[PDB]
Design a protein around this ligand. Structure first.
Ligand SMILES: O=C(O)/C=C(\CC(=O)C(=O)O)C(=O)O
Ligand SMILES: O=C(O)/C=C(\CC(=O)C(=O)O)C(=O)O
Ligand SMILES: [Cl-]
Ligand SMILES: [Cl-]
Ligand SMILES: [Cl-]
Lengths: 351, 352
């Protein structure tokens, strides 16, 4: 097959191609080779495909109607590497998730149910369910509205998303090492998975402030080398095997908030600096803020009460994470606002 | 306000952008620009809410229509959509995006396939110049598959040879709008030249680089970029380009001796980002400058002898050759260059 139907969408602060599962090769080696060609990878410019030469604009959602009881659609996230011939399936992606609901409704996978449509989305990569609510005025998806998210110009229709049962969905526990803190290459880190495996550490401990812009961080070869050494050192401890060629864990460098939020973060995902912050990445970081003795807890400003709005500051503003904690202080849910937009709909081609 | 249009996303040469039928876009320029900005996701350094790839070279538009001009198959207007300003500019040719125009026009039925290699004569509306491209149409259908390669694009595709005649002065009114082979601007000798793309040609070494740096190093060189932009703003009137402050011309061309067997090595700012490779008509202008005695380009170039000259223009990821025919007076009378293209996505683009 040399082409496939495809909707190009912005999902949250990321961008990529949304496919029906049936339209892609069933064999995953052939599927991944096709997706590389669709995107134009490997190429630092992605000039001969639809990737935008940024991992955050080189992403794929494979969506299908679900047979799981109570679930509307199944969603597989695939990261297409920009300049390697690698497609990875080892993580969730809550930004690209934002486009899944609207894509599924437009494609008839799930019926609109009034002016707003709840969509229960099984995230195949980790086996957990997320719930998105999509504006469907008059029974049709809209992308217009009054909502805004930092990192995206303008305003769009809101897409509230809610995540439960996130802890340990990749590493088998919230803290796969069993410790709140671990010393790695002479630095305290928290190894944490509440929907995204993360290594959380103080920006100041790897020799930056945590307030640098994306270009400054991407050009900092010395910083990138130092944190890559830590990432490779903890891959097995987080039950992720050999992470050398994986996209996980995400490296989260935290600092005290500056614009009135809970914490400030710079993320490497795992090699490129994030332009903003990942959705489940932010949930893991926000969760670490609540763990006494974590580097995150030391720099964070944490509100009182069972339902905590934790503003996570990032290079171009912030993204707020509403957590509720149970009896024992465990996070039992996380809710975040996203938006999406259909950008182009048609057929993608490969040679 | 228009909220969708049919659109083919293509790679044209080493560039990428949206190809539209003229009839599918707003007739009013202001409405058209607001639509195209929104299609691309501009202004936004990351172009996250549209189809632009956060680089001027992947934020380009071609507007194509069947031509009524005798002997011309299609009319093609090139539009640059700025990445992080609300500006769409029509002031230049674009010979990379031109490569997609032939195949696009045949797919869209604007020109019929003719044999297995279809000639397509293309009127470049921005300057009134014509290019002639040949498109592989085996069995009557465009193919993008083939054995040709161009530096800056992985793999191989169908060849699209292109030939340009009557190139000189199409934006500035003359090949050398100042009348001089060299002018001194901000302390350094430059050549102001237009052989299809208005350019300021200067020695890389005179502005503090070697000319062999990679694109990332050049885009990070704020001191260099400020020096170059001050020169650009100082030459707009001399080049008969009026007020260039919000324009994308002239292109700033920094030349050095060839290092990999070519005629000259170039780095180009277009005008603000460093080029990842080199523009097609920009290269023609630089190649032409190499032939002018006294030019900075002639001082660093290695120029082959003969009436037919293959001038290899070296750039950050290899080279692109310009085959120039020159007449007895030494004037360039045609330029021929190989490009390729590929259809990437076809369908409908949307805006709010
Ligand atoms: O870290 C990455 O790979 C990029 C992401 C991840 C994300 O959204 C999430 O953590 O849920 C993104 O911003 O798209
Ligand atoms: O200079 C620019 O703005 C970019 C160009 C120009 C081009 O191709 C040409 O000079 O004909 C490109 O697409 O490479
Ligand atoms: Cl399906
Ligand atoms: Cl719909
Ligand atoms: Cl038309």
């Amino acid at each position: 097959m040399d082409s496939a139907p495809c909707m190009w969408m912005r999902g949250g602060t990321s961008k990529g191609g949304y496919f029906l599962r049936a339209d892609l090769p069933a064999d995953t080696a052939a599927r991944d080779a096709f997706l590389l060609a669709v995107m134009g990878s490997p190429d630092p410019r992605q000039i001969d495909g639809m990737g935008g030469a940024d991992p955050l604009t080189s992403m794929v959602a494979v969506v299908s109607k679900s047979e799981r009881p109570g679930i509307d659609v199944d969603y597989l996230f695939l990261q297409v590497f920009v300049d390697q011939a690698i497609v990875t399936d080892a993580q969730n992606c809550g930004n690209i998730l934002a486009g899944v609901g609207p894509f599924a409704i437009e494609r008839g996978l799930v019926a609109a149910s009034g002016d707003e449509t709840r969509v229960a989305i099984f995230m195949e990569n980790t086996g957990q369910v997320a719930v998105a609510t999509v504006r469907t005025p008059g029974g049709s998806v809209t992308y217009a509205g009054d909502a805004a998210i930092d990192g995206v110009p303008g305003t769009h229709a809101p897409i509230p998303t809610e995540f439960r049962d996130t802890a340990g969905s990749s590493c088998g526990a919230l803290l796969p090492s069993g410790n709140a803190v671990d010393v790695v290459n002479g630095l305290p880190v928290t190894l944490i998975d509440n929907g995204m495996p993360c290594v959380v550490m103080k920006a100041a401990d790897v020799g930056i402030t945590g307030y640098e812009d994306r270009d400054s961080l991407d050009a900092n070869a010395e910083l990138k080398a130092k944190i890559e050494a830590i990432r490779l050192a903890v891959g097995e401890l987080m039950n992720l095997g050999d992470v050398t060629e994986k996209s996980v864990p995400k490296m989260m460098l935290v600092a005290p908030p500056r614009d009135g939020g809970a914490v400030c973060v710079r993320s490497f995902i795992p090699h490129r600096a994030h332009a903003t912050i990942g959705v489940l990445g932010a949930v893991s970081v926000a969760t670490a803020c609540l763990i006494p003795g974590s580097p995150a807890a030391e720099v964070a400003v944490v509100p009182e009460g069972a339902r905590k709005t934790l503003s996570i500051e990032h290079p171009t503003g912030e993204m707020s994470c509403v957590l509720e904690v149970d009896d024992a202080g465990n996070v039992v849910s996380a809710a975040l606002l996203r938006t999406a937009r259909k950008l182009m709909d048609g057929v993608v081609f490969v040679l």
